Design a protein around this motif. Structure first.
Motif, PDB file in Angstrom:
ATOM      1  N   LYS A 106       0.844  -1.181   0.000  1.00 45.72           N
ATOM      2  CA  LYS A 106       0.000   0.000   0.000  1.00 45.72           C
ATOM      3  C   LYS A 106       0.883   1.235   0.000  1.00 45.72           C
ATOM      4  CE  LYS A 106      -3.865  -2.129   2.429  1.00 45.72           C
ATOM      5  NZ  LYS A 106      -5.134  -1.810   3.149  1.00 45.72           N
ATOM      6  N   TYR A 107       0.464   2.250  -0.746  1.00 47.29           N
ATOM      7  CA  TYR A 107       1.166   3.521  -0.746  1.00 47.29           C
ATOM      8  C   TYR A 107       0.711   4.382   0.421  1.00 47.29           C
ATOM      9  CZ  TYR A 107       2.816   2.693  -5.533  1.00 47.29           C
ATOM     10  OH  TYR A 107       3.409   2.178  -6.661  1.00 47.29           O
ATOM     11  N   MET A 108       1.676   5.050   1.050  1.00 44.18           N
ATOM     12  CA  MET A 108       1.396   6.140   1.972  1.00 44.18           C
ATOM     13  C   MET A 108       1.764   7.504   1.399  1.00 44.18           C
ATOM     14  SD  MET A 108       3.055   4.054   5.181  1.00 44.18           S
ATOM     15  CE  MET A 108       4.171   2.794   4.565  1.00 44.18           C
ATOM     16  N   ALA A 109       2.455   7.550   0.259  1.00 42.12           N
ATOM     17  CA  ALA A 109       2.830   8.807  -0.369  1.00 42.12           C
ATOM     18  C   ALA A 109       3.481   8.529  -1.715  1.00 42.12           C
ATOM     19  CB  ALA A 109       3.792   9.606   0.520  1.00 42.12           C
ATOM     20  N   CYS A 110       3.201   9.398  -2.687  1.00 39.25           N
ATOM     21  CA  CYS A 110       3.939   9.447  -3.944  1.00 39.25           C
ATOM     22  C   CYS A 110       4.341  10.882  -4.207  1.00 39.25           C
ATOM     23  CB  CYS A 110       3.112   8.921  -5.112  1.00 39.25           C
ATOM     24  SG  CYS A 110       2.765   7.186  -4.992  1.00 39.25           S
ATOM     25  N   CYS A 111       5.644  11.119  -4.312  1.00 41.36           N
ATOM     26  CA  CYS A 111       6.179  12.416  -4.688  1.00 41.36           C
ATOM     27  C   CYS A 111       6.860  12.283  -6.033  1.00 41.36           C
ATOM     28  CB  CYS A 111       7.152  12.920  -3.633  1.00 41.36           C
ATOM     29  SG  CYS A 111       6.317  12.989  -2.067  1.00 41.36           S
ATOM     30  N   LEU A 112       6.410  13.067  -6.998  1.00 36.88           N
ATOM     31  CA  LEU A 112       7.024  13.082  -8.312  1.00 36.88           C
ATOM     32  C   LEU A 112       7.830  14.363  -8.446  1.00 36.88           C
ATOM     33  CD1 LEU A 112       4.211  11.385  -8.508  1.00 36.88           C
ATOM     34  CD2 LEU A 112       5.079  11.065 -10.822  1.00 36.88           C
ATOM     35  N   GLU A 160       3.889  -3.728   8.638  1.00 41.83           N
ATOM     36  CA  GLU A 160       2.662  -4.506   8.544  1.00 41.83           C
ATOM     37  C   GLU A 160       1.474  -3.747   9.121  1.00 41.83           C
ATOM     38  OE1 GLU A 160       3.569  -8.546   9.438  1.00 41.83           O
ATOM     39  OE2 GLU A 160       1.486  -8.976  10.012  1.00 41.83           O
ATOM     40  N   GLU A 161       1.671  -3.053  10.244  1.00 38.68           N
ATOM     41  CA  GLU A 161       0.547  -2.417  10.928  1.00 38.68           C
ATOM     42  C   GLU A 161       0.099  -1.125  10.254  1.00 38.68           C
ATOM     43  OE1 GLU A 161       2.060  -2.682  15.249  1.00 38.68           O
ATOM     44  OE2 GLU A 161       0.718  -4.404  14.986  1.00 38.68           O
ATOM     45  N   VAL A 162       1.022  -0.344   9.677  1.00 38.91           N
ATOM     46  CA  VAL A 162       0.604   0.870   8.977  1.00 38.91           C
ATOM     47  C   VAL A 162      -0.272   0.524   7.784  1.00 38.91           C
ATOM     48  CG1 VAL A 162       2.606   2.220   9.720  1.00 38.91           C
ATOM     49  CG2 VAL A 162       2.691   0.917   7.581  1.00 38.91           C
ATOM     50  N   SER A 201      -3.375   0.060 -10.508  1.00 35.17           N
ATOM     51  CA  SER A 201      -3.952  -0.321  -9.227  1.00 35.17           C
ATOM     52  C   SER A 201      -3.087   0.251  -8.109  1.00 35.17           C
ATOM     53  CB  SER A 201      -4.078  -1.839  -9.128  1.00 35.17           C
ATOM     54  OG  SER A 201      -5.341  -2.265  -9.601  1.00 35.17           O
ATOM     55  N   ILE A 202      -3.194   1.562  -7.929  1.00 35.94           N
ATOM     56  CA  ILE A 202      -2.456   2.273  -6.894  1.00 35.94           C
ATOM     57  C   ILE A 202      -3.352   2.337  -5.664  1.00 35.94           C
ATOM     58  CG2 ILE A 202      -1.473   4.484  -6.212  1.00 35.94           C
ATOM     59  CD1 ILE A 202      -0.879   4.850  -9.296  1.00 35.94           C
ATOM     60  N   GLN A 203      -2.985   1.606  -4.618  1.00 30.97           N
ATOM     61  CA  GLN A 203      -3.767   1.550  -3.388  1.00 30.97           C
ATOM     62  C   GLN A 203      -3.060   2.348  -2.301  1.00 30.97           C
ATOM     63  OE1 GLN A 203      -4.562  -2.350  -1.719  1.00 30.97           O
ATOM     64  NE2 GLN A 203      -6.325  -1.589  -0.549  1.00 30.97           N
ATOM     65  N   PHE A 204      -3.727   3.387  -1.805  1.00 32.06           N
ATOM     66  CA  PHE A 204      -3.258   4.188  -0.684  1.00 32.06           C
ATOM     67  C   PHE A 204      -3.904   3.713   0.613  1.00 32.06           C
ATOM     68  CE2 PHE A 204      -2.197   7.166  -4.082  1.00 32.06           C
ATOM     69  CZ  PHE A 204      -1.010   7.725  -3.635  1.00 32.06           C
ATOM     70  N   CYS A 213      -4.305   8.388   4.730  1.00 26.63           N
ATOM     71  CA  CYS A 213      -3.623   9.467   3.966  1.00 26.63           C
ATOM     72  C   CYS A 213      -4.606  10.094   2.980  1.00 26.63           C
ATOM     73  CB  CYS A 213      -2.405   8.962   3.207  1.00 26.63           C
ATOM     74  SG  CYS A 213      -1.511  10.269   2.332  1.00 26.63           S
ATOM     75  N   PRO A 214      -5.119  11.306   3.265  1.00 23.51           N
ATOM     76  CA  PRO A 214      -6.105  11.944   2.405  1.00 23.51           C
ATOM     77  C   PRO A 214      -5.471  12.303   1.060  1.00 23.51           C
ATOM     78  CG  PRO A 214      -6.019  12.958   4.591  1.00 23.51           C
ATOM     79  CD  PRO A 214      -4.777  12.112   4.433  1.00 23.51           C
ATOM     80  N   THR A 215      -4.326  12.977   1.099  1.00 26.27           N
ATOM     81  CA  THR A 215      -3.649  13.401  -0.149  1.00 26.27           C
ATOM     82  C   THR A 215      -2.461  12.474  -0.409  1.00 26.27           C
ATOM     83  OG1 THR A 215      -2.073  14.932   0.825  1.00 26.27           O
ATOM     84  CG2 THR A 215      -4.304  15.754   0.506  1.00 26.27           C
ATOM     85  N   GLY A 216      -2.496  11.698  -1.490  1.00 30.88           N
ATOM     86  CA  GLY A 216      -1.419  10.726  -1.734  1.00 30.88           C
ATOM     87  C   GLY A 216      -0.340  11.232  -2.670  1.00 30.88           C
TER      88      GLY A 216
END
Ligand SMILES: COc1cc2cc(c1Cl)N(C)C(=O)C[C@H](OC(=O)C(C)C)[C@]1(C)O[C@H]1[C@H](C)[C@H]1C[C@](O)(NC(=O)O1)[C@@H](OC)/C=C\C=C(/C)C2
Ligand SMILES: C/C(=C/c1csc(C)n1)[C@@H]1C[C@H]2O[C@H]2CCC[C@@H](C)[C@H](O)[C@@H](C)C(=O)C(C)(C)[C@@H](O)CC(=O)O1
Ligand SMILES: Nc1nc2c(ncn2[C@@H]2O[C@H](COP(=O)(O)OP(=O)(O)OP(=O)(O)O)[C@@H](O)[C@H]2O)c(=O)[nH]1
Ligand SMILES: Nc1nc2c(ncn2[C@@H]2O[C@H](COP(=O)(O)OP(=O)(O)O)[C@@H](O)[C@H]2O)c(=O)[nH]1
Ligand SMILES: [Ca+2]
Ligand SMILES: [Mg+2]
Ligand SMILES: [Mg+2]
Lengths: 440, 430, 69
Positions: free
Chosen positions: A311-317, A433-435, A340-343, A347-350
């Motif tokens: 799972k993603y918690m952030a993407c910075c380009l 695992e927990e996050v 299939s990018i799963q946040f 996290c409201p803003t990914g």
């Protein structure tokens, strides 16, 4: 103001620093003797590149950097290379005997004989800053010096500069280029010792980089020279926020806020595109859409793992070169749907997106084609835990039999430090695992 | 890094002299000690084995020891006998008569201080000493008994340095002295506890290579020693030329010795052919790799198919394709996975050096840490027990003051060493 | 509100001081243990080598005793 001090430690840290500082000089137009004909303010100035270069009265632009190694042959190459006139002799510190791939020698037996001198040279650099932002520390996981001495340095920096931020650029071991059978030991020991002293660490998996060079650049048997040149492009992209200024340029500290949701979870996964040779790029204009798409290919990650399974918690380009907001918007819109990018649900803003208008550059004779636009993605995904799992398994196999442990014990270490380091790794794998678990 | 080289006894000085011959040409040093090479690569690491004296003269950092004046006179007359420092010759008069007790306790003890003074002199001049290497045999008296005594004394003064031996195991196929098993066992008991790395150079395998593979009707010491020089040049390539893997003795030790007592290596050289077969067989990287891991090419009389590799180092020398090497080494590991312990991941390391040895376009040297070495120790133990069962000859040893159970101590220790290899050969990852 | 504003700033100062303090003390105690541990490993090895020198001299005295008969 906002100066950054670079510390290059051990062979990998030193050779990657050489690649980086040559690339910086090309990007800013600094000559191998330190002259910068483009700079009008002589003796000083508060310009953007001044975060990484100080200036002397004679007009020399001097890297805010320290190279340190426990033996001399690698730094000796700096002392006599193309950019030898770029550094003051005191910024290059060498010992007579290295760590012998032994964390214990780097942290204790040998390191303790040069630590004070290194911290001294650093103080001298810090004293030349008007608003020191923090440190960038380049080192391998596997070397005796990259692991052991880097740990000692980091503990010392916490004591002398308190909460001042420290970012790591670390080489994660790969059997295709690994110099020692005990690199999993040194890797777990340094990661345990450094976890609470590092604000954010960018891991580069030598096998990932090795494969990219073979597949995308057409180099049948890559060398360190191939690897470092590619690594330096990733490093340049991350620091470009600090060395240049643009209306759409966004600072690395703003990325850090998004990238580190909890202190221990500070290991972003990097990608870079396009990685292509002159031959293939001759008939291929790569669009923002194509290079953006490449950032989500598992095979383009700088650490071998599968983000589709996490799972993603952030993407910075971090875009750079010929890029306009309209094209980025369309590119991400496409990716959101076709992928299939799963946040995580907390996290409201990914996505966070910036453009640095400075075009990518390449060293003459390098393997990278010169392209008009490039993109570096820093993401925080639980998938990076796969790299910890793979290391921990190699550790457990050897440690179950105490193989090689007598080398560390003979140097003064206790077994307890091993299992303490390993248990910390166990908690880290659990934290990832927990996050990832959905909210109640 | 600097290495201090010590060579003791007949065998030690024979193979040592050949070692200096072979490497002096590899680096471009004539018998007068002047440099005559053609590439800066030969001088990069020249200080590992050579001091520099006024006039760009290179002198081996080597010390020559023997209880018998004879053998060192001839070394002085052989080729390169003039490049050695004269004050570094330390010789006795009595001789050891293949009597371990004489070399270790009585005759050798009286002369050991003279050697120590030369070793201090040489280590004094080292910018950063890395450790010592010793050449000797285990079957004689001086290199065996006084050899292990030197290691003991040097380890006392330099406890944190690396102690590396090239040890020539006895074999009845090559010597008829019946007490060599006594002398070998008494010294294997010292090596197991006082050296960090020991290359096991077995006269049994050396002879067999000459007879079966090389088709040499009646091999001589010249032949046997050419295999040794070729091997020694191989295992020291990465110490003498610019490289990254196993660049020094300690990094080699850290990579090759997972447990302190299991530091006995079995080396191998390749290519090796008979005169007739050399014509119709071109040497390639696949040919080099296959030969390297074949039991026929082992410098110790062991079949690696009878045990398991703990660690392996492989050095290729010559102009070849790095990619070919990587593929050939992966394939051999793949096909032979059962013969590598699984609790030590990635336990085969490979180096490539650009300069070939003289006379070949390609060579490959093998350094194995394998539980199969226990076959070598079992052989000596077998002959030891046969002799000791009837207490043949001990009055020669006990006459120097030795005790009987000192013999059983050594034999028992060597027995534990064999079991130790079996313990890790039988261990699994689950 | 003003008491609380000082409260917060002083707590920030205290957490940073405690961070420095613990790093300082953990480091110090690790250098100490390693010094002791490495020096003891060397003493043990050297104590053993001398115990062999003791046996050699006893082997010499033993030779002369049998030498008078
Ligand atoms: C029973 O018949 C034999 C009668 C002799 C020798 C042998 C046999 Cl089998 N051989 C060959 C052996 O069994 C091996 C070896 O022989 C030699 O070393 C010798 C060949 C030089 C030896 C006797 O077992 C060795 C001892 C430890 C003894 C050897 C020595 O006496 N000196 C010494 O300190 O101890 C040595 O000195 C050079 C003199 C010579 C003896 C000789 C020739 C009698
Ligand atoms: C010179 C050689 C060349 C070679 C070319 S192609 C091939 C398979 N081998 C090899 C290797 C030499 O390093 C030496 C190790 C073997 C010892 C011999 C020098 C031996 O002493 C000698 C008497 C021989 O048997 C030959 C001269 C026939 C030697 O060429 C055999 C050999 O394998 O040498
Ligand atoms: N990417 C990259 N990895 C490198 C480089 N040099 C070494 N490494 C890797 O780093 C590890 C070895 O650590 P080194 O940095 O060589 O060792 P060191 O820090 O000098 O430590 P000691 O020599 O033992 O004191 C292995 O995994 C190597 O593959 C380099 O230039 N680039
Ligand atoms: N390979 C090899 N073995 C040798 C050589 N000279 C002696 N040996 C062996 O060494 C053993 C005897 O040791 P030696 O060196 O003669 O006795 P020392 O002088 O008392 O150390 C026997 O097993 C011999 O076969 C040599 O030149 N080459
Ligand atoms: Ca300026
Ligand atoms: Mg190094
Ligand atoms: Mg003899």
């Amino acid at each position: 103001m906002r100066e950054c001090i670079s510390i290059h430690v051990g062979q990998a840290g030193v050779q990657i620093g050489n690649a980086c500082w040559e690339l910086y000089c090309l990007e800013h137009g600094i000559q191998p003797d330190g002259q910068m004909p483009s700079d009008k303010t002589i003796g000083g100035g508060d310009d953007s590149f001044n975060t990484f270069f100080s200036e002397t009265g004679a007009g020399k632009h001097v890297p805010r950097a320290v190279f340190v190694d426990l033996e001399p042959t690698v730094i000796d190459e700096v002392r006599t290379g193309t950019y030898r006139q770029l550094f003051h002799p005191e910024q290059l510190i060498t010992g007579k005997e290295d760590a012998a791939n032994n964390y214990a020698r780097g942290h204790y037996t040998i390191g303790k004989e040069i630590i004070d001198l290194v911290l001294d040279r650093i103080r001298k650099l810090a004293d030349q800053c008007t608003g020191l932002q923090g440190f960038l520390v380049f080192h391998s996981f596997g070397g005796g010096t990259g692991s052991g001495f880097t740990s000692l340095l980091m503990e010392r920096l916490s004591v002398d500069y308190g909460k001042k931020s420290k970012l790591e650029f670390s080489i994660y071991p790969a059997p295709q280029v690994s110099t020692a059978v005990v690199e999993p030991y040194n890797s777990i020991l340094t990661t345990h010792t450094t976890l609470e002293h590092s604000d954010c660490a960018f891991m580069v998996d030598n096998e990932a980089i090795y494969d990219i060079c073979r597949r995308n650049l057409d180099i049948e048997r890559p060398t360190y020279t191939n690897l470092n040149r590619l690594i330096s492009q990733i490093v340049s992209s991350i620091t470009a926020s600090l060395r240049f200024d643009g209306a759409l340029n966004v600072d690395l500290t703003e990325f850090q806020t998004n990238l580190v949701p909890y202190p221990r979870i500070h290991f972003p996964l990097a990608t870079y595109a396009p990685v292509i040779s002159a031959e293939k790029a001759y008939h291929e204009q790569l669009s923002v859409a194509e290079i953006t798409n490449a950032c989500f290919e598992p095979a383009n990650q700088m650490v071998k793992c599968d983000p589709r399974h996490g799972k993603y918690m952030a993407c910075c380009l971090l875009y750079r070169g010929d890029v306009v907001p309209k094209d980025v918007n369309a590119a991400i819109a496409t990716i959101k749907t076709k992928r299939s990018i799963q946040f995580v649900d907390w996290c409201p803003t990914g996505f966070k997106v910036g453009i640095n208008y400075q075009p990518p550059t390449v060293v003459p004779g390098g393997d990278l084609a010169k392209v008009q636009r490039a993109v570096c993605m820093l993401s925080n995904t639980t998938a990076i835990a796969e790299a910890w799992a793979r290391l921990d398994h190699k550790f457990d196999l050897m440690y179950a039999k105490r193989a090689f442990v007598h080398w560390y014990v003979g140097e003064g270490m206790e077994e307890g430090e091993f299992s303490e380091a390993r248990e910390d790794m166990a908690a880290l794998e659990k934290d990832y695992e927990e996050v990832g678990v959905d909210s109640v | 890094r600097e290495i201090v080289h010590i060579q003791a006894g007949q065998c030690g000085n024979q193979i040592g002299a050949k070692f200096w011959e072979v490497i002096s040409d590899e680096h471009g040093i004539d018998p007068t000690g002047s440099y005559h090479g053609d590439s800066d690569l030969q001088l990069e690491r020249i200080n590992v084995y050579y001091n520099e004296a006024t006039g760009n003269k290179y002198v081996p950092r080597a010390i020559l020891v023997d209880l018998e004046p004879g053998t060192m006179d001839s070394v002085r007359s052989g080729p390169f006998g003039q490049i050695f420092r004269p004050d570094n010759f330390v010789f006795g008069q009595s001789g050891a008569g293949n009597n371990w007790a004489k070399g270790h306790y009585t005759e050798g003890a009286e002369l050991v201080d003279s050697v120590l003074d030369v070793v201090r002199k040489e280590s004094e001049s080292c910018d950063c000493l890395q450790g010592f290497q010793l050449t000797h045999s285990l079957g004689g008296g001086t290199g065996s008994g006084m050899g292990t005594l030197l290691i003991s004394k040097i380890r006392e003064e330099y406890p944190d340095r690396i102690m590396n031996t090239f040890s020539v195991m006895p074999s009845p196929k090559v010597s008829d002295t019946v007490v060599e098993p006594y002398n070998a066992t008494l010294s294997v008991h010292q090596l197991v506890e006082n050296t960090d790395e020991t290359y096991c150079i077995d006269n049994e395998a050396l002879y067999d290579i000459c007879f079966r593979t090389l088709k040499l009707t009646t091999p001589t010491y010249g032949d046997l020693n050419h295999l040794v020089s070729a091997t020694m040049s191989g295992v020291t390539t990465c110490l003498r030329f610019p490289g990254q893997l196993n660049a020094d003795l300690r990094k080699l030790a850290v990579n090759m010795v997972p447990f302190p007592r299991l530091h006995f290596f079995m080396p191998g050289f390749a290519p090796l052919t008979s005169r007739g077969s050399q014509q119709y067989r071109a040497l390639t990287v696949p040919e080099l790799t296959q030969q390297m891991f074949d039991s026929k090419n082992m410098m110790a009389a062991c079949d690696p198919r009878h045990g398991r590799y703990l660690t392996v180092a492989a050095i290729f020398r010559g102009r070849m394709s790095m990619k070919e090497v990587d593929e050939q080494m992966l394939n051999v590991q793949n096909k032979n996975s059962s013969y590598f312990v699984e609790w030590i991941p990635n336990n085969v390391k490979t180096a490539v050096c650009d300069i070939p040895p003289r006379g070949l376009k390609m060579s490959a040297t093998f350094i194995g840490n394998s539980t199969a070495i226990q076959e070598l120790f079992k052989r000596i133990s077998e002959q030891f027990t046969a002799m000791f069962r009837r207490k043949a000859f001990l009055h020669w040893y006990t006459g120097e003051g030795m005790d009987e159970m000192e013999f059983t101590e050594a034999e028992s220790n060597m027995n534990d060493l064999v079991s130790e290899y079996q313990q890790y050969q039988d261990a699994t990852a689950d | 509100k003003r008491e609380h504003e000082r409260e917060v700033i002083q707590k920030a100062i205290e957490e940073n001081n405690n961070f420095i303090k613990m790093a300082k003390e953990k480091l110090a105690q690790k250098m100490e243990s390693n010094k002791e541990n490495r020096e003891a490993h060397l003493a043990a090895m050297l104590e053993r080598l001398q115990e062999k020198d003791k046996h050699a001299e006893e082997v010499r005295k033993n030779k002369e005793l049998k030498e008078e008969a």
